Design a protein around this ligand. Structure first.
Ligand SMILES: [Mg+2]
Ligand SMILES: [Mg+2]
Ligand SMILES: [Mg+2]
Ligand SMILES: [Mg+2]
Ligand SMILES: [Mg+2]
Ligand SMILES: [Zn+2]
Lengths: 145, 267
């Protein structure tokens, strides 16, 4: 099964504990993910049911919390169902404070390349979405503080 | 002897959806120019939330009106483009309750037509459509902004964007239309600039149909006009109503908005 992987790295002008407090909230992706209309959650193993806003090329996602480490600031999510042509999707989020208060976030993932679309379009599609979310994260943190 | 104003019928429904994100603007006699009575009709298909569609319904005719009061001769393209860009600007500055990040993914198509005593002006941005029925013939007065429309594909790449098929041709894989009011996060790929047609009224004109893709995604131009044709043999509201019912009967799971303007003289 054809597979692709990518990674998005961005620097956010906010302190680590602020940024992390938002990312770690598995049950509330809506806080910074514009395409999320609603999310209900049913620590590790937690499953969340996401509904997507109109205009987006999907209506739902079903995602499972694989790992949440509040010591090393890492989250591991995996999409286990959905309408979004994203099959066997599994992502890691790593948060670290900036050596300079600022935060760097690294979001990486693997997913099956869907039938009928190139690796490059699959990468572009997901990367683009992640940058939106990281952009909103920055906006939100800038507000909260 | 006959009536200067046209009989209009409107049907704008939620359909099988939970949220209504269509909106409709009906402003007959909305202005006069050189002692000529002008009319405004508009359909807006929202996405993300409803508020951009609603905003157009509340402002667009006003904005067009102010622009008309300063237009030279008959330069309607300039007038409509300015009006549409101004609408977008206002939106730039409710389900999502106007809150981030969700308000950062909202826009609307806008299809509008100013009907003067001599002309039909259609200003379109998005994939709603205006179709003229005349001599039985179905004549589209706008051309949908689809990301795979070949000229639209090229314009997007020239703005540095890309088109990806993902449940249809989509701008950046996301939006199913290449133009829209709002959606700043998708500028400059998706722009609010409308394309404008101007067509002379004839004695053969039957009616004008403005409608969201709730209608056109299942009912083609030729069968729309045919339904409207026989209803005219409120007749306009009978046509609007019959058209949306037809789209629902063809299992439309989308909001449906149909406007039917009667063009021939009466009373
Ligand atoms: Mg949906
Ligand atoms: Mg819509
Ligand atoms: Mg001028
Ligand atoms: Mg629609
Ligand atoms: Mg459609
Ligand atoms: Zn809203």
């Amino acid at each position: 099964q054809k597979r692709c992987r990518s990674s998005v790295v961005e620097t956010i002008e906010a302190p680590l504990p602020l940024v992390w407090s938002i990312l770690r909230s598995f049950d509330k992706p809506q806080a910074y993910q514009r395409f999320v209309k609603s999310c209900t959650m049913r620590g590790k193993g937690s499953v969340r049911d996401v509904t997507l806003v109109s205009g987006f090329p999907a209506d739902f996602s079903t995602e499972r919390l694989e790992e949440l480490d509040d010591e090393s600031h890492v989250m591991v999510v995996s999409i286990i169902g959905g309408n979004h042509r994203l099959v066997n999707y599994k992502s890691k989020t790593k948060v670290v404070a900036s050596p300079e208060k600022k935060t760097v976030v690294v979001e990486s993932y693997v997913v099956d390349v869907p039938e009928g679309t190139s690796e490059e379009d699959t990468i572009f599609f997901v990367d683009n979405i992640i940058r939106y979310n990281l952009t909103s994260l920055a906006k939100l943190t800038k507000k909260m503080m | 002897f006959f009536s200067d104003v046209p009989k209009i019928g409107t049907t704008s429904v939620c359909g099988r959806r939970r949220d209504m994100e269509d909106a409709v603007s009906i402003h007959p006699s909305f202005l006069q120019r050189n002692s000529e009575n002008h009319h405004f009709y508009g359909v807006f298909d929202g996405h993300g939330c409803s508020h951009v569609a609603e905003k157009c319904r509340e402002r667009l005719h006003d904005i067009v009106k102010k622009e008309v009061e300063v237009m030279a001769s008959d330069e309607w393209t300039e007038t409509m483009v300015k009006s549409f860009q101004k609408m977008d600007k206002e939106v730039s500055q409710c389900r999502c309750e106007l809150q981030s990040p969700q308000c950062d993914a909202v826009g609307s198509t806008a299809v509008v037509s100013v009907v003067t005593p001599e002309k039909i002006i259609v200003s379109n941005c998005g994939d709603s459509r205006a179709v003229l029925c005349r001599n039985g013939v179905a004549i589209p007065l706008s051309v949908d902004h689809k990301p795979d429309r070949p000229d639209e594909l090229i314009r997007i790449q020239q703005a540095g964007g890309r088109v990806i098929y993902w449940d249809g041709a989509r701008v950046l894989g996301v939006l199913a239309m290449s133009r829209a009011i709002g959606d700043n996060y998708l500028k400059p790929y998706v722009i609010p600039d409308p394309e404008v047609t101007v067509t002379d009224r004839t004695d053969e004109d039957e009616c004008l149909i403005l409608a969201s893709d709730g209608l056109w995604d299942v009912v083609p131009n030729e069968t729309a006009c045919g339904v409207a044709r026989m209803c005219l043999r409120n007749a306009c509201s009978d046509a609007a109503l019959l058209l949306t019912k037809l789209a629902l009967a063809r299992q439309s799971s989308d909001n449906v908005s149909v406007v039917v303007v009667d063009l021939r003289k009466r009373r």
